Amino acid sequence: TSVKVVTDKCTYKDNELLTKYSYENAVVTKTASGRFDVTPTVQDYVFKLDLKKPEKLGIMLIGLGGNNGSTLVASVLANKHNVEFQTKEGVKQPNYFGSMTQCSTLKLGIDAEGNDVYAPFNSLLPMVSPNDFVVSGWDINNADLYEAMQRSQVLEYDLQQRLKAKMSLVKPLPSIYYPDFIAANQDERANNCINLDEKGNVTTRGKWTHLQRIRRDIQNFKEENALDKVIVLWTANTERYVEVSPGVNDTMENLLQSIKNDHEEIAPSTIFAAASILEGVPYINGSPQNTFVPGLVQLAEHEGTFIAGDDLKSGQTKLKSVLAQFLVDAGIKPVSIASYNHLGNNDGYNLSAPKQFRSKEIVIDDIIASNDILYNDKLGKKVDHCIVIKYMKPVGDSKVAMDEYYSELMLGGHNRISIHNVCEDSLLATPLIIDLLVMTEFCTRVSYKKVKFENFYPVLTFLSYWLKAPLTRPGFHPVNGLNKQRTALENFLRLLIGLPSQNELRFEERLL
Amino acid sequence: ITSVKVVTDKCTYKDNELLTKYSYENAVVTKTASGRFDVTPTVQDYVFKLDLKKPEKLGIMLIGLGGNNGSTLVASVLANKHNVEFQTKEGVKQPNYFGSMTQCSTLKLGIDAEGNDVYAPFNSLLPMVSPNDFVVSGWDINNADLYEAMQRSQVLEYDLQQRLKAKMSLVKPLPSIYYPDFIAANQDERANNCINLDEKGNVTTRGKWTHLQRIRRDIQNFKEENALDKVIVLWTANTERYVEVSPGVNDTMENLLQSIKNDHEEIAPSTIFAAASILEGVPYINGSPQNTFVPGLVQLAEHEGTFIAGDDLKSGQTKLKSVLAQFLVDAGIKPVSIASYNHLGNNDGYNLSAPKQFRSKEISKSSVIDDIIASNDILYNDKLGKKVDHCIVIKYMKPVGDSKVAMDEYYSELMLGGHNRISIHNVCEDSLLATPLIIDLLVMTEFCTRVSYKKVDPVKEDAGKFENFYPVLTFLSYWLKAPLTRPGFHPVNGLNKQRTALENFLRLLIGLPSQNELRFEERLL
C-alpha cells in the first residue's frame, strides 16, 4: 500500500523529497469599536524529507519495567512474530488497535463517483513500523519483562505465556533513583540503581557521573545492536516538579553546571534528557513533571536535538476535551465539569502523594477563551472544574473515569451529560507511545527552509495530540483541541506530498 | 467445621432427627368502613421435625444442561470439589462459590459477651448438602459435551476450561424433548439431541405420553446409575412461550394428564418435564419465566405431594431493583417511572430476541413492583395517582457475550415539586450470578424435603401427625423473579423480606426467636 501524487510541487533526488508549500494564515486586530481587521499572510516553504528510514529503530524506555513499558515490548513481539493467543472468546490475532499511525486512515480525495477515498495513515510517506523497534531501557526495579507483565496484569494470561520465553530475556538496565523526587512508597521497588556511593548506598551525589553512565548506556545499546537511530522516551513514575530558578537551570551552561554541582533542582528525568540531548537522540517526556526547564531547552536547540512531552494524554482527557469543544461549538455553555478517576496500578499508586498528583492535575480555559459570546463578564466567563484521581488497587490497571458536564441551554434550560469510561489504561497508553515514537522518528527526517535547511524545530508541537500538557515555545500558548491536533498532523503529511488542507466544501456535490 | 449449639428446651434430638416446638404469631386485620384497623393477634403452635441425616450425594438433573448456566454449574462443582485453582491476569485464583447466599452469606446468631453482633455461616446452623456433593446430569436438545458447551458459552476463564477439559468432555446431555413452536425459531438448527422422533427420525410433537414415560425412566436410570436416593430437577433451558390455560385442557390434574396423552398443543416440553418429575416424586424447579405450572399441574403436585417451585431466576438486575424500589417507598418517596434496559450476546438473549420469548420475561421482570405500590396508598391513590410507568427492554448484542449490561432509571417525586433521578448501571457475566443462585435453590429445596411439621393443640397433647411443606415452596421466592403463589395469596417480591423469612425459618428450627433489631441491651438502661 502506497500513495503517488502527480504534482509539480514535489521532486525526488537521491532518496530525498523536496516539496514546495505556501503557508497561509492571518493576523487579526480588533479595533476599539470591536471591529475585526484581518490581513491575510503567506509564507513560502520548501520541505526536505529524507526518504531513507532506519531499517531498525532503537527504543530506550525509562520505566521499561512498568505497565506501559512491558506492554510496549509485548505488543512489538506479539505482532512482529504473529503470536495469536487464546481467550474465552477464542483465538485472537495480535494487532495495534488504538494506534493512530498503525490503525487510523486518512482521506486522500474522492473517486470518480464523488465518494471519499481513504488510505492508511502511514501509507502516504515512509514511516518506521513498531515491528522494527529494538527495545531496551532503564528501571529502578530489575525484574525481567516477563515478571513485569505478570506484575502489571494487563495482558491475557495465555498471551503472557506465549511470550514468556522471549520476554524473560529482556531485562531493564539499572537507573537513576533520587528518592525525594517520587512517591516515597516507591522505595523498596528500587533494587536496580546506578547512583550508589562507595558504601554501596543510593546517593544523589555524583550526578555528573550518573549523566555520563546514561550516555554510555545509550552508546552501548546503539553499538551492541548496530543501530544508527535511537529514541528515548520517559514512561516512569511522575516526578514532583522542580523549581526553575535563575543561575541554576535557566541556561544550558548553568544546567550542565548544576548537574556537576549535584544541585537539588536536577531530577533523574533532567539527567536522562540532558544525556539523550548530548547523544543527539530525540527525547520524549511522557509524564507531567516539568523536565524541560529553560536550560534543558537551550541545550536541545544548541545540539539541534528533538525533545517533546508533558504527559501521556489520557484517553479520558483526550475525549473529555473533545466533548467540551463539541458543546461550545454548538453554542451550548458548559457551566460545570466534574472529573473523577480511580485506578489500581503503580501509576495510581505513585499519584497517591499530592506532590506526584499535583503534576498530573495540570485546557478548559482555551475553549472558554474561544467563545466570549457565552463567556464574558455580563453572563459569567467562568467554568467550575475539578480533577480527582484516587488509588483503588482492586481495579488494577483497568481504570474507571467519569465526567459529568452540566450546561445551560436557552431560556433557563439545562443539560447534564455523564461519561463513564472503563478500560485498561496501558492498552491505550501503549499505542499512544507507539504513535509518538513513530512520528518523532518521522520528523527527524524532515527539514525546512523559508523562501540552508533547518531542523523541524526541536519542540515537536504536532505531538500535542498525544500529550496532556503540550510543551511550547516561549510566548505561544498550547492548543489542546484534539481534532485540531490530528488535523495538523494530517495536513502536514498532506502538504509533504503536494495535497492541500482539507476544506470539506465538497463543491463537486454542493454546486451545479 | 463451624457449628451452632443452641441451649434451649424447645429442641430435642431423637434418632437423627431434631424436634422443635415453635409458637407462630401473626395477626388478622380488618378496616372499619369508617377507617379504623381492628387487629386481632393470632397464635398457632407447631412442632417441626428435621431429618438430620442429609444425603451423601444429591442428584441434580438440569434441563438445558448444555447452556451457559448448566455448563457453568457443572464447572463450578468440579472446580470446587477438586480445588481446581486456575490462572488469570490477576494471578492464580482458588475456586469458590461467591454469589451463593447459601454458601457465602452469614446470619446473626446474637450478641457476644461484650454486646457485639455475632454471625455464622447461613449453612452452619442446620445440616445442608454442599454443592460439592452434587452429582449432575440432565437433558439438552443439543449434543455438545460440556467442554464444548463451556467453549461455546465463553463464561469461564480460558485456563479454567482447560483444566476442566478432560472431565467436562465426558459429560454429555441426555436427548430431550423439542417442540419447535414453544421457543424462538432460531434454536431450530440447534436441536440434534431429541427423543421425540418419528419413523424417519424427524422432530415430532406426537406421542407426548411416551415422552413423559421416557423422561421418567431417565430420572429412574440416572438415580440408580449413581446409587442416589435423592434427585431434584431444575429447568434452565430456553424460555418457552406462555401456554394458554383452558377449561378441560390443563385446568385440572385429570384434564392435563389426558391432554398430554392427546398430544394437546398447549402441553409444552416444560409441562412434560414438570409432570414427569412430579409423578416420580422428584422436586421440580422452574428457572424460566414461562407459566409451566398451570392449574392441573399444580393440582397434580398437590395430589402427588411433590415439591414444585419457580418461574424465572431472580436476575441480579431485578434483585437489585426490588431492593431499591422497596427502599424508596419505605422512605416515603414516590417512584413515578422506572425504565429498565439491557442487552446480552449469549443464547439466552438470542432466544429472547423473539417477541413471544421476551413476553414471558417481560411479565416476571415487571410484576416485581406491583406489591410495592399496593402497600402504600398514601403515595399511590386516586388523588395523586397510583400508576408507575415501567418499561422493560432486552436487546440482543452478540459482541458482549455472556456479559449482560443492565441500565435502570428511577424517576421519583419528592416533596413540594422536587424529583429524584437514580440511574443503576450493572455489568457482569450474567451466568456467574445465575449459577450460584441455582445452587442456592437446590440446596434449600433439598433442605426443605427433610422438614415436616404438625399443628400443636394447646389443650390436648400431641394432636395430629407430621405433614410436609405445602407443595409450592414459596420459601424459594428469594431466588425467583415471579414467585409462584398458593391459590388466594398474592406474591411478595420484597427481597429483604424474602431472605428474612429464610433467616427466621432457620433460626426457629434451632429454637431462636425472629430477629427484632430492637437491641434493648444498649437502647435501655
Place this chain on the structure above:
Amino acid sequence: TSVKVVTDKCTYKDNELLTKYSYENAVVTKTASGRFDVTPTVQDYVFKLDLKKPEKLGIMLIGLGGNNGSTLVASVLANKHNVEFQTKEGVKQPNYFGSMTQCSTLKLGIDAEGNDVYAPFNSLLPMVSPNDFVVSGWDINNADLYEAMQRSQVLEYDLQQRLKAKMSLVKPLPSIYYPDFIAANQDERANNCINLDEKGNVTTRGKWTHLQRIRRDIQNFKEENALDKVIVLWTANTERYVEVSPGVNDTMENLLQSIKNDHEEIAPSTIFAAASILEGVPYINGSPQNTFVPGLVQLAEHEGTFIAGDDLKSGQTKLKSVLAQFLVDAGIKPVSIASYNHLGNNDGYNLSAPKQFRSKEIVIDDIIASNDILYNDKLGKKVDHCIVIKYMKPVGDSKVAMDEYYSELMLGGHNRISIHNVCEDSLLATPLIIDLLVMTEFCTRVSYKKVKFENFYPVLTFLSYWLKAPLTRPGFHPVNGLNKQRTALENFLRLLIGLPSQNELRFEERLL
C-alpha cells in the same frame, strides 16, 4: 385513620398506655474449635406511653436561615395551609413526600384472604404532625426566611411567591459565632451574633453569658407562644471536631466549668446543646461534628434529657449502605467502593475546608465484619473505599452523587455497579428532619421498667436511621444497616400496641 389491637398486653389508664413486652435475644460464644454456643435470653418489660401529645410542638432550628431551615419552614406552611402551586407540569398539591413518618406505611398483619394489610406509619400510636410545628431558631445571618428561600434556590419560584407574605415574617434570632470553628468563608455571612464585646465586636469570650442567652431564647420562645414542648435541632454549617481532653469536657462539671472558663474546646454547638439540656428540651445534632462529648452526655443523663445525632444521613449514604449490604447478604464480595459527590450550596461551600469535610468523611467495616466467609486473612478482609465531596456552585442545591461498586463473583468473575443519584439535597434532608422531630417528641412520651419507670435512655438509638454517624452508648458499636434501623422503629411501634416482631414466615400459606 387509627389502629385498635385486641390484646391483654395493653391497658389504658388516664390517657396512659401500659404494655407488657418480653424481649428475647441471645448471647453467643465461639468455642476454640469454632463452635457457636448460643444461650437465649429474655427480659420482661412494661412500657408507659403518655397518650396526651402536644397540640403544638415548638421547634428551634440552629441554622434556621439555611437550605434545610427555610425548606422546613416552607414545607410546614405549605402543607398546613394547603398552598397549591404552579409548575410547568401544572398545579401541584403540597405534601411531605420523603418523610417516613408522614408518607410510609407498615404491615399490621393479614386480612381474610391471606393478604398483607398496611397502615400509615403514624397511625398506630398518636404522633404530632409537622402541621402543628411552631418554628423559630437561630442563624448567624439575619435574612428573613423568604430571603433565605430565594438564596437557597430550592423551591419552585411560584411556591416561593405564594409563601412570600408568611415567610417574610419569620426571622432568625442572633446566634453564637466562634469563627475558628467553621469554614473561614462563612465570615461575612455572620451579621447576626449575640457574642459581641463592648467594642461591638465578635468575641469567644464570655461563653457562659452566651449559654445563658440561649436558655433565655428558649424560655422566651416557649412563653411567647404558650408552648409546653420544644425540641432543638442543629442544622447549621458543620463544625470542626473539638478535642476531648480530661479535665475539660470529660464530665458535666468540667464541661460546665470550661464553658465559664471560655475554654477553646467549647464550640457553639456545645453551648446550644448544654443550653437545651439545662432547659430540659431534647437536642438533636444534625451535623457530623462531635458535639456530644463525654461531659455533655453526663449533663444529659443527669438532667434526664434526650439527645441524639451525628449527621443528617445523606440519601446517598443511606442507599449506598443498603446496596452494599444487599451484595454481602447475597454472598457477593464488594472488593472496592468509590463515592464521589459534588454540590453547589453553602453546605458544600463550608465542606470546602478539609476541617469541615473531615468531620463529614466520617459503616463499611460493619458489613465486612458480618461476613468472615468472604472477609478473612486467607481471602482478604479488606475493602478499598473512598469518599470525595467537591464544591461545584453551578449545580446549586441539586447535588449529584455517584457510587461505583466493584465486586468479585465466583470463578474469577467480577461485577461492576454504578449508582448515579441526582436531587435537591434539601428536599431529602427536610423530611428527614421532620421524621427526627416527630420521633424524638414521640420518645419523650415513653418510659420503661424491667420486670419506677425510667426515661427512654437519652441517646435515642432508634434515630440512627436518619443519622450517618449513629451516636452510641459507651461500649456498644453502632449499626447502620438502614433496613434494620427501620425494622427497629417498626417493631418498637408494634410492641407498644401488643404486636410481635415481623417474621415473614407466612405459615398461613407455606404450611398446609
